[PDB]
Amino acid sequence: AAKDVKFGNDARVKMLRGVNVLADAVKVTLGPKGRNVVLDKSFGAPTITKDGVSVAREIELEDKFENMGAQMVKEVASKANDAAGDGTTTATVLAQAIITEGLKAVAAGMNPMDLKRGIDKAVTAAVEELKALSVPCSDSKAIAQVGTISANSDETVGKLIAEAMDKVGKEGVITVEDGTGLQDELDVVEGMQFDRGYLSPYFINKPETGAVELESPFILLADKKISNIREMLPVLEAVAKAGKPLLIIAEDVEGEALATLVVNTMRGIVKVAAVKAPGFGDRRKAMLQDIATLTGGTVISEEIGMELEKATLEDLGQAKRVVINKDTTTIIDGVGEEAAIQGRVAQIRQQIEEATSDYDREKLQERVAKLAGGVAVIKVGAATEVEMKEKKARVEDALHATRAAVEEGVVAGGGVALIRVASKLADLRGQNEDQNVGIKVALRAMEAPLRQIVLNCGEEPSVVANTVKGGDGNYGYNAATEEYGNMIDMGILDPTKVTRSALQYAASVAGLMITTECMVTDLP
């Protein structure tokens, strides 16, 4: 109903207070010497967390304006985490630093748009310098070392990741699965991974990983929009009689249909997950047919004439395991005759040599690569169940980190990369003095995370920051052992994607914060 609006300095200082509270919450959990923070729970047992992702998830301020600012910073930090797999705390610290210094400059009389342009210029130059500084990791030894470093210096997980990428491919689909016994066997199975996540966060049955897991599910794929329940009633009853979960992949499931399947999943009569089918246009239909071939099913397309009412359980395909993340899905070991899979691969290749342009042939190459590459499952195992669980968590984290590293590269971790590129960009200039002020703001913010890490360590921030500043290359400071040296050799690695994404998203949110002049929020 009625809303109150704040114009000028008041709204911006409300954002400053909100982001400062979020930083107070999160930045203390940065670096190896990360202080514990208590997240109270209504059930009765408070949870102590050293990771800032949960802390950011649990922050929500009381004042509407401060809450709005903190929530925008949290949103961009979550975007950075989704894109890179890490860097939530670093992105939040960078964003808070840029916001603080930019607001201090604006209150002096600087033009917010010029400050944003200076921030953008400095961040672009920093990304370029980071790409220059990134150390490639494409060899098997480099991949193994990165995987080992990420998962608390364990050689077994590093070897598993290295051999998995050797088998399925450098950019192949790799997933972690609980394995039976002490040994951890690895093999490749037919499957796909199209990056279009769940329609609703109410399908999540594994909230710890923030993902959706189905065991031996049924794959129902229809080349049509679904917004009515009566079409899915027969297939839902059929799968409920079967008892196995059902996976829905179609153009879109919205309206009463999405609500009713969400309600049914929440009640627990039958577990159903729905994700919209990959692509759009004719390529969407081609990918849907490829999935049906992979999982030994048929496409329920209204174009042919047959519809969901007559859809039996036999015509729709099935798989052995489906993992649906926030952004992607993974059919693992789809049951289906390999003869049909090779026939589809041959047909796609024939289309490739019968292409008309480079774009369509590239799309066909992507499709055939996803279809024929397969999925490598890491059946990680340990002596006990809890050890297997915690080892699986470590292996999944290492897999994410190694995927990021192989995608972009490895650069000096612990905030050394950001301060190094800030040093290398000491000569940046803008077309105006305000742009220079913005560039200086960006550089100071870029050096801030190392200062916060060494402050949580205990040592004086300025001295360590200056000492790292004087050095060249990847030489930096390790808070774990309070000694200097070459960072990558000593084993403190952060993927180039993580730092790049953190810096870029912090710059984006800071630019949005600085230039904001009004707020429209509900009355308290």
Q: Which structure tokens are listed for 388?
A: 């297997």
For residue 257, with 0-12 CB atoms within 10 Å meaning exposed, 13-18 middle and 19 or more buried, which class applies? buried
Residue 318: which H helix or E strand, with range? strand 317-324
State how far the Cα of 382 lies from the Cα of 360, in Å rounded to an integer: 46
What residue ranges in 338-488 does DSSP mark as E strands? 375-380, 410-412, 475-478, 483-486
Helix, strand, or coil here: 297? coil
For residue 383, report the phi and psi dihedrals to the nearest 5 degrees: -70, -45
308-326 in b/e form (b: 16+ CB < 10 A) is beebebebbbbbbbbbbbe
Side-chain half-sphere exposure of 518, counting CA atoms within 13 A? 4
- Only one residue has tokens 């397309």, namely 301
What distances in angstroms separate CA 73 from CA 57, 67, 279, 391, 498, one per listed residue? 11, 10, 30, 32, 17
For the annotated binding site, the residues are: 29-32, 50, 86-90, 414, 478-480, 494
Q: Give the position of tokens 């914060």.
A: 513
Question: Residue type at 151?
Answer: A
User: Quick one: CA dihedral 462, 464, 465, 467, positive or negative?
Assistant: positive
Rg value, the chain, Cα: 25
What secondary structure does DSSP assign to 222-257, as a single string? ESS-B--HHHHHHHHHHHHHH-S-EEEEES-B-THH
What gap in Å lies between CA 195 and CA 224, rounded to an integer? Answer: 19
- In the DSSP assignment, the letter for residue 482 is T
Q: What are phi and psi of 459, to 5 degrees?
A: -70, 155
Q: Please compute, for residue 342, the number of CA atoms within 13 A of its CA located in the half-sphere on the CB side.
A: 3
Cβ-count burial 271-281 (b if 16+ within 10 Å, e if not): bbbbbbbbbee
CB-based contacts of 44, cutoff 8 Å, min separation 6: none
Alpha-carbon span 220 to 313, nearest angstrom? 9
Burial of 96 (0-12, 13-18, 19+ CB in 10 A): buried
Q: Which residue has the tokens 């203390």?
A: 28
Domain 191-371, CATH homologous superfamily name and number: GroEL (3.50.7.10)
- Resolution of the determined structure in angstroms stands at 3.3
Sequence-distant (≥ 6) Cβ neighbours of residue 339 within 8 angstroms? none
- CATH 3.50.7.10 residue window(s) in the chain: 191-371
By DSSP bridging, strand 375-380 and strand 173-178 are parallel
Q: Which fold, 1-134+410-524?
A: GROEL; domain 1 (1.10.560)
Distance CA 477, CA 493 (A): 12
Structure tokens at 147: 């995987």
Residue 201 CB neighbour total at 10 angstroms: 12
Q: How many CB atoms lie within 10 A of CB 306?
A: 14
Domain 135-190+372-409 in CATH 3.30.260.10? The answer is yes
3-state secondary structure of 258: helix
Residue numbering of the annotated binding site for ATP: 29-32, 50, 86-90, 414, 478-480, 494
**Where along the chain do the CATH 3.30.260.10 domains lie?**
135-190+372-409
DSSP-based three-state secondary structure for 270: coil
Helices (H), 151-281: 155-168, 229-242, 256-267
Experimental approach? cryo-EM
Strands (DSSP E) contained in 15-102 are 37-39, 47-49
Measured CA to CA, the distance from residue 87 to residue 401 in angstroms comes to 11
- Listed in sequence order, the residues at least 6 apart from 58 whose beta carbon sits closer than 8 Å to its beta carbon are 39
CA distance 147 to 154: 8
